[PDB]
């Protein structure tokens, strides 16, 4: 008896999962010949390549538990294998007599490298590998082909390409496994009946004092519930315009499906299909780029440009990226990283990010503009790394692509438009309720100076119980001065890049 293996990496779902569906149908169309091992590998190698903060570890822990729970409802289970894929797969290919291995493809360079190796090993041991592109709606390889070998570098050109592509068929959940025995323990399972059980919170979260509020629980079950809740107001869905959603409402103004889409707890193909059904029903609706479908297409757009560029997450060697002489300023980077810049709006966003792991798109604009071209003139690569640590929805392509946009390094070139860290929040939160929540030491400042506490006299600062320089920091830079200087620096950088 030989085993069929589905390998979860992203695609942490049962629904719309061709790679997992195929394994299950095969076992049921040939009962008694096959064992089924759906596995997730806790790969120590990823940690040399990315930073993972406490909140995202908890999201993953919750996700694996949910996935295990869901697979048990199909008379299977999740097997979580600790170890490096390069060492894990030779062992299990033999110990399990693996006939077929399936998985969902991914475009990240670490994935491409790791997957090539596993495919060279699988080819040697005569294991059939079947892969499916279901993390994105469109296959970036096909978008690039249709555009004659280059990724489209504007959203509009990208949309014109993908309109002519076939939308994939969205699958349901696999059928339960008919009359399948629990596979026989292997070398590892026999010395430890739990060697493959889902990690506990304690095993994955080494810094539990860094966990914030548990607001967006991991897993497909929660993803589908949140999707269904977001889709209940069909008018809100149909008429959604991303630029008009508030970054500093106390409740999120957008769907917060991004963590679920990042891990593939939610199929983007399913979400796209559900959105299209509502749009069909609601004749007055928005269009890309600002519509909700438009948002999924931004994800597709960045996945496509990123697929063509292994250096997408760095300035050097990145075909898209303007070479800009960013400066090193460790103290300013640290103040930004910890929300101690002395601009309350910026600090509120960075504290929400650290505590909760999600901030709105335009809140990400504000802080990324401040770090890079707007104020501190620090490389977007530094911002990317902090976001990588703190965001539940950390996504190699999306983080890099939007950082390049916000820093005017690629895709966006109107660097003379600079967010103000004082004025920008006021449009949608003139009372500063968001600042009061995340910078509570300012909570007694009136609306007239809560965005600009340095405009309060010392007497009033003492009265409000928050003296600048003691209880809340002084501004680390004066926006009105530095952002004018940075516009000149950017223009110089654009000139140099144009001459090369
Ligand atoms: C500096 C910076 C870094 C970012 N890093 C990430 C990241 O690491 N991971 C991430 O998922 N998004 C990232 N984004 C994009 C965007 O801000 C988030 O996708 C969005 O805030 C998710 O919130 P939401 O799910 O409520 O989005 P909604 O507005 O409800 O959109 C639905 C989905 O569309 C996609 N989407 C929406 N906006 C964008 C966008 N601008 N680019 C790409 N896809 C988009 C996401 O999958 C999102 O879940 C970043 C943006 C900026 C400016």
Domain locations in the chain as residue ranges? 1-135, 136-167+220-308, 330-495
Contact (Cβ atoms closer than 8 angstroms) between residue 41 and residue 97? no
Homologous superfamily, domain 330-495: DNA Cyclobutane Dipyrimidine Photolyase, subunit A, domain 3 (1.10.579.10)
Residue 259 CA, closest ligand 1 atom number: 11
d(CA 204, CA 56): 10
Beta bridge partners of 5: 37, 101
Q: What is the best residue among 289, 361, 380, 405 to mutate for testing ligand 1's pocket, by most ligand atoms within 8 Å of CB? A: 361
- Strand boundaries in 397-495, DSSP class E: none
358 among annotated binding-site residues: yes
Q: Which atom of ligand 1 is nearest to the CA of 388?
A: 8
d(CA 369, CA 298): 19
- The answer to whether 301 is a known ligand-binding residue is yes
Interatomic CA distance for residues 345 and 438, integer angstroms: 9
Interior CA angle at 88 toward 18 and 43, to 5°? 75
Binding-site residues, ligand 1, Cβ < 6 A = 242, 252, 254-258, 261-262, 295-296, 298-299, 302, 360-361, 364-365, 368, 387, 391, 393-395, 398-399, 402-403, 406
In CATH terms, the fold of domain 136-167+220-308 is 1.25.40
Q: Whose C-alpha lies nearest to ligand 1, atom 30?
A: 255
Q: Does 300 belong to an annotated binding site?
A: yes
Gap from CA of 393 to ligand 1 centroid (Å): 8
Q: Ligand 1 mean position to 461 CA, how many Å?
A: 37
Report d(CA 307, CA 313) in Å as an integer.
11
355, with CB counted inside 10 A (0-12, 13-18, 19+), is: middle
3-state secondary structure of 129: strand
| Region for 285 from its dihedrals, namely left if φ exceeds 0, alpha if ψ lies in -120 to 50, beta otherwise | beta
Tell me the C-alpha to C-alpha distance, in Å, between residue 304 and each of 313, 404, 449.
14, 15, 44
Q: Please tell me whether 297 is known to bind a ligand.
A: yes
Contact 12, 80 (CB under 8 A): no
Cα separation, 364 vs 255, whole angstroms: 15
Cα–Cα nearest to 467, from 350, 375, 342: 342
Q: Distance (Å, rounded) from C-alpha 380 to C-alpha 177?
A: 48
Sign of the dihedral defined by the CA atoms of residues 134, 140, 143, 149, in that order: negative
Burial of 289 (0-12, 13-18, 19+ CB in 10 A): middle
Query: What are the phi and psi torsion angles at 468 (to 5°)?
Result: -60, 135
Distance CA(416)–CA(418), nearest Å, equals 6
Going by C-beta distance under 8 Å and a sequence separation of 6 or more, which residues neighbour residue 470? none
Q: How far is CA 494 from the centre of its chain?
A: 30
Per the structure block, which two tokens stand in for 492?
Answer: 């110089």
DSSP per position, 99-136: EEEEEE---SHHHHHHHHHHHHHHHHTT-EEEEE--SS
Give the count of alpha carbons within 13 A of 375, CB side only.
26
Local structure of 30: helix, strand or coil? coil
Token code pair at residue 461 = 């600062």
Q: Is 361 annotated as a binding residue?
A: yes
Topology alike, domains 1-135 and 136-167+220-308 = no
Q: Are 135 and 21 in contact (CB under 8 A)?
A: no
User: In degrees, to the nearest 5, what angle opens at C-alpha 194 toward C-alphas 192 and 197?
Assistant: 150
Quick one: 1-135 is in which CATH superfamily? Answer: HUPs (3.40.50.620)
DSSP state of 183: P
Q: Which atom of ligand 1 is nearest to the CA of 403?
A: 1
Q: Residue 291 half-sphere exposure, CB side, CA atoms within 13 Å?
A: 19
Q: How was this structure determined?
A: X-ray
For residue 128, list its beta bridge partners: 100
Task: Give the whole-angstrom CA distance, residue 234 versus residue 239.
Answer: 8
């Amino acid at each position: 008896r030989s085993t069929l293996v589905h390998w979860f990496r992203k695609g942490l779902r049962l629904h719309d999962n061709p790679a997992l569906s195929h394994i299950f149908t095969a076992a049921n169309a040939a009962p008694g010949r096959y064992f089924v091992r759906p596995i997730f590998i806790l790969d120590p190698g990823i940690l040399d390549w990315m930073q993972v903060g406490a909140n995202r570890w908890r999201f993953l822990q919750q996700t694996l538990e949910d996935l295990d729970n869901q697979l048990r409802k199909l008379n299977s289970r999740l097997f979580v294998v600790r170890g490096k894929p390069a060492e894990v797969f030779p062992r299990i290919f033999k110990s399990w007599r693996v006939e077929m291995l399936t998985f969902e493809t991914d475009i990240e360079p670490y994935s491409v490298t790791r997957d090539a190796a596993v495919q060279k090993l699988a080819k040697a041991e005569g294991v059939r590998v079947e892969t499916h592109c279901s993390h994105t709606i469109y296959n970036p390889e096909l978008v690039i082909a249709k555009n004659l070998g280059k990724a489209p570098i504007t959203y509009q050109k990208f949309l014109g390409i993908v309109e002519q592509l076939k939308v994939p068929k969205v699958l349901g959940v696999p059928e339960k496994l008919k009359n399948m025995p629990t596979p026989p323990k292997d070398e590892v399972e026999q010395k430890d009946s739990a060697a493959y059980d889902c990690p506990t919170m304690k095993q994955l979260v080494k810094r539990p004092e860094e966990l914030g509020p548990n607001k967006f629980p991991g897993g497909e079950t929660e993803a589908l519930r949140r999707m269904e809740e977001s889709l209940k107001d069909e008018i809100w869905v149909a008429r959604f315009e991303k630029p008009n959603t508030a970054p500093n409402s106390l409740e999120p103004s957008t769907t917060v499906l991004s963590p679920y889409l990042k891990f593939g707890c939610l199929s983007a193909r399913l979400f796209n299909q559900k959105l299209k059904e509502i749009i069909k029903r609601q004749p007055k609706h928005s269009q890309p780029p600002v519509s909700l479908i438009g948002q999924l297409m931004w994800r597709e757009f960045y996945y496509t440009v990123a697929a063509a560029e292994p250096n997408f997450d760095r300035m050097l060697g990145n075909v898209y990226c303007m070479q800009i002489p960013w400066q090193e300023h460790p103290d300013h980077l640290e103040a930004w990283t910890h929300g101690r810049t002395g601009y309350p709006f910026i600090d509120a966003i960075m504290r929400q990010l650290r505590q909760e792991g999600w901030i709105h798109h335009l809140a990400r604009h504000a802080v990324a503009c401040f770090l890079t071209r707007g104020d501190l003139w620090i490389s977007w690569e530094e911002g990317q790394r902090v976001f990588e640590q703190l965001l539940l929805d950390q996504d190699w392509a999306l983080n890099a692509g939007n950082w390049m946009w916000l820093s005017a390094s690629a895709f966006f070139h109107q660097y003379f438009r600079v967010y103000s860290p004082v004025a920008f929040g006021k449009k949608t939160d003139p009372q500063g309720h968001y600042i009061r929540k995340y910078v509570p030491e300012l909570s007694k400042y009136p609306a007239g100076c809560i965005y600009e506490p340095w405009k309060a006299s010392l007497v009033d600062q003492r009265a409000y119980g928050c003296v600048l320089g003691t209880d809340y920091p002084h501004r680390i830079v004066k926006h009105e001065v530095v952002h004018k200087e940075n516009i000149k620096r950017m223009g110089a950088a654009y000139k140099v890049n144009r001459e090369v």
